[PDB]
Enzyme design. Structure first.
Site, PDB file in Angstrom:
ATOM      1  N   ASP A 141       1.197   1.505  -4.920  1.00  0.00           N
ATOM      2  CA  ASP A 141       1.689   1.205  -3.803  1.00  0.00           C
ATOM      3  C   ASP A 141       2.794   2.058  -3.406  1.00  0.00           C
ATOM      4  O   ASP A 141       3.829   1.880  -2.824  1.00  0.00           O
ATOM      5  CB  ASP A 141       2.020  -0.180  -3.158  1.00  0.00           C
ATOM      6  CG  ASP A 141       2.216  -0.475  -1.680  1.00  0.00           C
ATOM      7  OD1 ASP A 141       2.431  -1.624  -1.290  1.00  0.00           O
ATOM      8  OD2 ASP A 141       1.866   0.547  -1.024  1.00  0.00           O
ATOM      9  N   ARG A 171       8.195   2.778   1.991  1.00  0.00           N
ATOM     10  CA  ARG A 171       8.467   1.325   2.236  1.00  0.00           C
ATOM     11  C   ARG A 171       8.963   0.597   0.975  1.00  0.00           C
ATOM     12  O   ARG A 171       9.348  -0.399   1.137  1.00  0.00           O
ATOM     13  CB  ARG A 171       7.485   0.709   3.050  1.00  0.00           C
ATOM     14  CG  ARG A 171       6.334   0.404   2.176  1.00  0.00           C
ATOM     15  CD  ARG A 171       5.076   0.079   3.041  1.00  0.00           C
ATOM     16  NE  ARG A 171       3.739   0.341   2.340  1.00  0.00           N
ATOM     17  CZ  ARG A 171       2.857   1.335   2.743  1.00  0.00           C
ATOM     18  NH1 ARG A 171       2.864   1.949   3.596  1.00  0.00           N
ATOM     19  NH2 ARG A 171       1.735   1.209   1.848  1.00  0.00           N
ATOM     20  N   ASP A 182       8.676  -2.436  -6.927  1.00  0.00           N
ATOM     21  CA  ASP A 182       7.661  -3.144  -6.790  1.00  0.00           C
ATOM     22  C   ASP A 182       7.947  -4.397  -5.891  1.00  0.00           C
ATOM     23  O   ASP A 182       8.987  -5.257  -6.050  1.00  0.00           O
ATOM     24  CB  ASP A 182       7.231  -3.617  -8.079  1.00  0.00           C
ATOM     25  CG  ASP A 182       5.696  -4.741  -8.034  1.00  0.00           C
ATOM     26  OD1 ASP A 182       5.109  -4.930  -9.195  1.00  0.00           O
ATOM     27  OD2 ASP A 182       5.105  -4.840  -7.012  1.00  0.00           O
TER      28      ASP A 182
END
Ligand SMILES: CCN(CC)CCNC(=O)c1c(C)[nH]c(/C=C2\C(=O)Nc3ccc(F)cc32)c1C
Ligand SMILES: CCN(CC)CCNC(=O)c1c(C)[nH]c(/C=C2\C(=O)Nc3ccc(F)cc32)c1C
Ligand SMILES: CCN(CC)CCNC(=O)c1c(C)[nH]c(/C=C2\C(=O)Nc3ccc(F)cc32)c1C
Ligand SMILES: CCN(CC)CCNC(=O)c1c(C)[nH]c(/C=C2\C(=O)Nc3ccc(F)cc32)c1C
Lengths: 293, 291, 293, 291
Positions: C155, C159, C173
């Protein structure tokens, strides 16, 4: 003033005392090798490793024949050895004695002595080929380690490889503990007596000692090795004719017992262009990739 | 002595660095000394063959002696030995055949850090940036140390600024004149930057790894002062040296966080073996970072 | 039985207790982020480092809404973090609490919050270009570290980058501490809600998460970054048409503020052939060589 | 869970390994199991384009199921992930297109070490060579450990011998049948090499890094025994397991130096965290070397 980036050499730098070891814990024994000014001695070191109360070690020390020049050389050697680090394939520093007497440098003892002698006393009952592949691989790894620490060996030759257990070979500095006016492998050029038959031409003519200079010597070492301890360019004296031959590009032929892959490395080590020579890292990787052939 | 460490200045010049000088144009002089200068320049096809970039070229004036030709060639061989790092000015190429030796390195568009700090002293750029400068210069020195190199003149005036907020340690050798810079002062034979030098370097003329750390401390002091001059007001004389030997030191810069001051202090330990190493200074900072 | 060489994953392996830290030395404060099942909390840790009696830290923990699946996920995360090692450009493990209560994972606190928010609240008064070059270099280094430890980030996106002192950015994370059914950047594909606009096609169609999959996301991150916090493929919803467009080979155009060198990296990251994509090590070296341009 | 470690068996097949199968000839079978075999072979232009070499090729029999195709492909991806080392059998290439999967690895002309030790048990090759075997196999395991890999069947029978006195750890997966080898014995679901397995592996079915070290100890025992069988005379039953749990162990091989025996003993610590790591075992030996 000019050039603010200055390389500092470990020779000129504080002696770390973590190496210092009590000279009242060494018992000197038989000499293993001597020059005019120094000698390597077999010895027992008590309480050097908490597991071995008494281990055999080698001690390098000057003879009372020695001047200030030699005393500093021995201390430089000690300092150099102190920065290298350990590796299985060199003879490692164990400790030193500087306070309260002459300098003593304590290194590993190698029970089987040096490789050239071993090779020669074995030339008849021919230890076999696989041991020779093993020695050249191990010496390559040891040179690769020295080069990764930015270190050069200016006398790489079978006479400076020692044998210990586990079939391990170890590169060695014999400096001071060898008499070279008695050895025909060392020959006068300029002021010095040098091992010119192991030396790269750029080393002989232009006095340049690079990392590829060592690779040339490694090549002569392989020849030395697969000839089972014979001299390089056997029979031919070092003189004007030799230097000319080396300069023109004449090279030795394959030893009778060299596999084709090794002679191949030999030849590239002897390229007149240093830049076309393999590095020790490449030699090691080559020997590993080709080990099954 | 069979084992020998290679000195970089003894190695032969590596031709992988050679670059055609008909691919260079020169512009304005960036810095000049008695025997040489550094000039702004364009090189075409230096990194990409398609493209052109601005670079800095160092070269000797027509009045240079063999000692300066050697210095310039040594500068080149050391740079070649070090290899690249984000926090030094890097070698990009050289012109050696077909005329005077030219040493091509990175151009740093923002100039030196001392001048940058002074012109920014008015507004106060913030404390977070001074932290980054500290960290980067220490990373750069830790790197030089790892290649067994020392810097003889670590000072905010030899630190350059480029894009990406990146700072780079630079060798200004030969491209600065010092005969009129109060920061360089006669001692014994030479003119030296004494306010930046460790005590053992001034006396016994011992230049080692721990000498640099001292200078790093003086740098940290310049830095958090916004480029004020070190030991301000005091001239260098017998008074000065005697005081440094007897433990005299600078106090915390008005704008230093206490921790950074503590590093300065440890950098100024009269005992060389009590001073931190650069690797240690990097690792400190990399934790003084979240707090 | 077959295949004797088995890769062991640090998830399945003993929890090293050198990390364990007394939960009676933490004071929880304001929440920083929460998902349905977990949350990250601001906290004070007393006696965590002998120099700082009280430092702010972040604590990851489950909410009582959480099942066995989540409890194991959090422990896996803890185990993973425990093997990585430290690096300046990630958020590092400081300790954990496993005994005598729910699992608590203690990591670094980053006072300036996350990069996307920062970028957006700053879109008007445009912090400048050089800070953006710095962030992409630092995120590259952090991905290079993760990849040298064989670790992938599934991911990577603005952000999940945090800001701390010294102008340092840190990869993070956010697993469990973020609610994705509320965020349109996460969209249903198969069973999961995924960040498909940051994902490599081979990840979307063939469910393959390689090291080059990350490099694609890094590319989208650069676009995200030089657009000052805008969404990727702005305005266009994820659906059949999108997947087709990605598959055919359509790519975003350069952000208005991207220097030519960066868009260049962007584009190679988005090569349809993963093998033609740069590695993180190459990206870092490219940014360093070109830093003066 | 954003952070995830890559499993090598999940990565896509790298085509850099692809090799034309019309450049292969097959000769005699080296080893065969129920679902596959390993064959001696010639590959032309494999390392040098000029030349030919003998290699080993692993492949599935026509009676292999999807689980075996996966095993063989996983073997290939793990080998590709590990990279080269002098003390494992290395991947040299693969044939994946145009027919059955073929995995090309190094041929080891001297065969496996167990058989070598037995046929040499007559004359006594000396103790210096057994030391080298110890060191090499530990170097090989230290290497597998560093890539986070475990070997499920470390035993003298899976150690091969090649030129240069070199020993190589090998995965014999799929190319050995075990239904008739007393060394493999039914426990629970599978047939396992129980005399080589650590106690926690037999019970809780925990296969970890410290499980391998146990097996290294049993290997050292095979080694200095010249290939005698482990726990000689004892069959594997309830008696056996119960005894291993209650601390039962083998005593020193007749020909082991005391130090090597001490390493065996530390390898057999009932507590997994008290056993040495391979890196530690390497470093011991690298000093037990001069003494
Ligand atoms: N008898 C032999 O031939 C013999 C033996 C058993 N040892 C040596 C020499 C050295 C050793 O063991 N360590 C060293 C370290 C340095 C050095 F310069 C020589 C040696 C010889 C010549
Ligand atoms: N102030 C300015 O304007 C200024 C600028 C924009 N650059 C420099 C200097 C150098 C640069 O960029 N690379 C170098 C490499 C070597 C060196 F010795 C000096 C420089 C200055 C003084
Ligand atoms: N206010 C803010 O925006 C803010 C601040 C000051 N911190 C965070 C988050 C984290 C932090 O500091 N460490 C972490 C470690 C893990 C994680 F998943 C989130 C965080 C936010 C969102
Ligand atoms: N005994 C012998 O004759 C013999 C010889 C000379 N080689 C092998 C086996 C292998 C080899 O050389 N490479 C491999 C790679 C994988 C593998 F599973 C087995 C081998 C045997 C059994």
């Amino acid at each position: 003033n000019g050039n603010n980036y200055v390389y500092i050499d470990p020779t000129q730098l504080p002696y770390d005392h973590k190496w210092e070891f009590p000279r009242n814990r060494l018992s000197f024994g038989k000499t293993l090798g001597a020059g005019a000014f120094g000698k390597v001695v077999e010895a027992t070191a008590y309480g050097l490793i908490k597991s071995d109360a008494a281990m055999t070690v080698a001690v390098k020390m000057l003879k009372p024949s020695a001047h200030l020049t030699e005393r500093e050389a021995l201390m430089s050697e000690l300092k150099v050895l102190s920065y290298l680090g350990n590796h299985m394939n060199i003879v490692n520093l164990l400790g030193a004695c500087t306070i309260g007497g002459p300098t003593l440098v304590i290194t590993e003892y190698c029970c089987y002595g040096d490789l050239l002698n071993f090779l020669r006393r074995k030339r008849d009952s021919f230890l076999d080929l696989e041991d020779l592949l093993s020695f050249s691989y191990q010496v390559a790894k040891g040179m690769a380690f020295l080069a990764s620490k930015n270190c050069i060996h200016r006398d790489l030759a079978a006479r400076n490889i020692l044998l210990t257990h586990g079939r391990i070979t170890k590169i060695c500095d014999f400096g001071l503990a060898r008499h070279i006016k008695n050895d025909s492998n060392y020959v006068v050029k300029g002021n010095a007596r040098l091992p010119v038959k192991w030396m790269a031409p750029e080393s002989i003519f232009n006095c340049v000692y690079t990392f590829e200079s060592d690779v040339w010597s490694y090549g002569i070492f392989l020849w030395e090795l697969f000839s089972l301890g014979s001299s390089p360019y056997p029979g031919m004296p070092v003189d004007s004719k030799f230097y000319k031959m080396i300069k023109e590009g004449f090279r030795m032929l394959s030893p009778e017992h060299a596999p084709a892959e090794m002679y191949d490395i030999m030849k590239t080590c002897w390229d007149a262009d240093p830049l076309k020579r393999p590095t020790f890292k490449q030699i090691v990787q080559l020997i590993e990739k080709q080990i099954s052939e």
